[PDB]
Symmetry: C3
């Protein structure tokens, strides 16, 4: 590892993913990343409910880190003195030391640097895991995805090449916001004060909200995802704590690795796939019709009532062979 060239990657905010190559002629590198933890109160719904949140780099989810199989990930994790809690990081993509958590315990005002070999291809969850407060840090927002691409790019079941033209990252967060005697959601002055009440809601296993990217409607309106007919999108979906079942309304998973590990053949033509709590998965879809699609958790209560749904606005020409309104709504003859 010490013989290798180093490279420095600038991260970008979800739902985007930082520029990267798929298939590459480059040999292994030590790829250097930095993330800074930010605790903060966030508004998570249309009615102004707040979450005492914890984030990597200020976002839910954290940014997606992209490397290739055989690369070494070298992360500097920074925990500013303005934060209240200790933190660390557990990479599911890593081998040893509780995913790196044991080696990255950072109090406010501290930082650490971890290196590990990304020797397995796939999308992998990373998350905070401080001893004794693991679920709280995770459900409060401290997770994201490491994508380790195969050096020669994605392959189908027959070993033929697959690619995406555009990649999006979606983190789905089951939230456990307490209510007071009046049935209204509680607003907490500090992160520490939210703790006890939150654990109580957590233990019921019933989320109050389930949101993409930190808020009801985060991926809608001005913030809808975008594509054009003929473009192939990669949709990375992470859920660090609870199962979900992604679905693209009016579309499909053309090729899907629902367990998220690229050395396995993908499945094709999926209507709905399954992301296990504690994992990230990946779906390819090539758009064939223009219009506004919904991308959602297909427990439709979890989607429409609780918040697990976004939109993708697709430009291009309508295709009558694929779908045609033969007769519009009109009185019954």
């Amino acid at each position: 590892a010490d013989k290798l060239p180093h490279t420095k990657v600038t991260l970008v905010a979800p739902p985007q993913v930082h520029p990267h190559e798929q298939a590459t002629k480059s040999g292994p590198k030590v790829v250097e990343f930095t993330m800074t933890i930010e605790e903060k109160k966030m508004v998570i719904d249309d009615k102004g409910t707040t979450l005492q949140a914890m984030t990597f780099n200020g976002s839910m989810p954290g940014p997606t880190l992209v490397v290739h199989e055989g690369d070494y990930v070298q992360l500097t994790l920074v925990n500013p003195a303005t934060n209240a809690m200790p933190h660390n990081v557990d990479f599911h993509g890593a081998t040893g030391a509780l995913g790196g958590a044991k080696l990255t315990n950072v109090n406010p005002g501290e930082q650490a640097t971890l290196r590990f070999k990304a020797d397995r291809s796939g999308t992998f969850v990373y998350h905070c895991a401080p001893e004794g407060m693991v679920p709280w840090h995770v459900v409060s927002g401290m997770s994201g995805t490491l994508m380790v691409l195969p050096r020669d790019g994605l392959k189908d079941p027959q070993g033929k090449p697959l690619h995406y033209d555009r990649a999006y990252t979606i983190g789905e967060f089951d939230l456990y916001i307490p209510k007071g005697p009046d049935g209204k959601y509680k607003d907490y002055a500090t992160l520490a004060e939210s703790y006890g009440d939150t654990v109580q809601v957590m233990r019921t296993l019933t989320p109050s909200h389930i949101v993409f990217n930190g808020k009801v409607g985060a991926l809608t309106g001005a913030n809808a995802l975008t594509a054009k007919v003929g473009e192939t999108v990669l949709l990375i979906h992470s859920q660090a704590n609870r199962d979900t079942r992604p679905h693209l309304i009016g579309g499909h998973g053309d090729w899907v690795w629902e367990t998220g590990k690229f050395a396995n053949p993908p499945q094709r033509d999926l209507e709905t796939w399954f992301i296990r709590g504690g994992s990230a998965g990946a779906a390819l879809y090539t758009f064939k019709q223009p219009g506004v699609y919904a991308y959602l958790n297909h427990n439709l209560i979890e989607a429409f009532e609780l918040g697990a749904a976004g939109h993708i606005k697709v430009e291009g020409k309508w295709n009558d062979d694929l779908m045609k309104q033969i007769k519009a709504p009109a009185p019954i003859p």
Copy 2:
């Protein structure tokens, strides 16, 4: 599509599936179907609890529509003036326009005709999805399965032929029936009056009932499914809103497409498979022993307490090689 021969299919009520060919020499057709929406109060359990239900063709689930890959599905959806609500249809088997929902918005007294190309093989959920009331219409009963068979029939992982002699369709419905201050289930005079109370139960994510084909015990007694030793059955299982885990007690999934998409190799020898909420899956089993089998959701609370279980009565000769009572129950020596 306009060059093709049209064919007209008569639908049948679940658990049966309309006569169809598996492997076929026929070229692509425009296959024409009609469904009429019926809202109605249904009795859903042994104690007389009612559901203000909504159905395609009067049944939960709707009838299964069967075509071949490359066919065009052409559906006339009828919403009689005797209904109270608007409806539409979203085919997961279709590409574009939110699965056809945007093109099939029918008020009571209206109808519409949608065509789409069934270009992907598998079992696919179809369901009602009116803007702003999607989960309610789905959980109230408005879903079913489109089966798109490969033109050359089902294949195993090695590409060898598979077939069924008999097909059954099972729709599993998580119901959210409200209770009054007395703890008794509420009985509603109209569909509209059930709405607010139902959404409240929905948001708890805890079903009051989980039933096959519209009622506790729907597929039991006089209504048990049937087969004989040596016959291969296809069990189509749809769940449009919530995960389930089918299991045949005393049997197996000989070949199972749990994600329901026939271009993928099936898995063999399954004890229990997994249907993601928002999908339909398909299992083949060839009976080897006679007797009454249970086919159920293997969360046994969901099965035995909540209603997710049916029976299959199997004729034929017992096989001592497969199973033998060596010593019947008798006092401990």
Copy 3:
């Protein structure tokens, strides 16, 4: 079957699995086992909560039975007069008679002997299933795993040999312990007295506890699982009633059959896999780093709050290529 040699297997208590061969030159046998049912009150958590439990052989889960594909399993099931309830056994590995339940109905003071052909390879749940009380017997602890190995051992997707050096069996139990008006868990004088209150908790679908091997912390401290760097472990995970999502923190599923059926190719490099309620699955992992790993259900609430987590203590030499602390926690420059 009557022509075959008989062999007699002595069972061992979980998390161990009785000595057995993987690939074998031996032809089919009638493999004889005996299990004795024990009902008993068990302490299930750190605060002294009790469960009115029911067990095969005194343990949760029951012991794992291991045979080869083509063998006949011949089980003597004993229900001592000191027990209060009738019992039986349903082998998911078996064909006919509700998995053998119909042929093994044993009242206290009775026993029975069942034979069946283990004609399908994989890990399969077995559980008690007395008519009218199936979920109660299962959730109270009456389940375990039958492992049917392929005669020529485990194989990878390409048909190359796989093996384990050490096998562990983990049964995960969703428990439904009632509470009294004071919010404290109830302590019941007899098994029968726990019944009504328990069914009520069951119907909420919310477990009070979710535990590995009968107790919070069962597989921790003195009782942690063990291995060394370079050793391959098989982790058998059974869940007879509810879904779970196993994860090894700092490790992976090198080869995983999450549906648990060995004639299917395994998936590789998994971070988290999925065991469907009503099944057993199997993962291989070869240790590469020393240290204390956690093996847990990656719904982290279910793990850390409810009890679904154990430890594996691994001996050996640290590997800096796989992971290295480049800079330990230190003040931010």
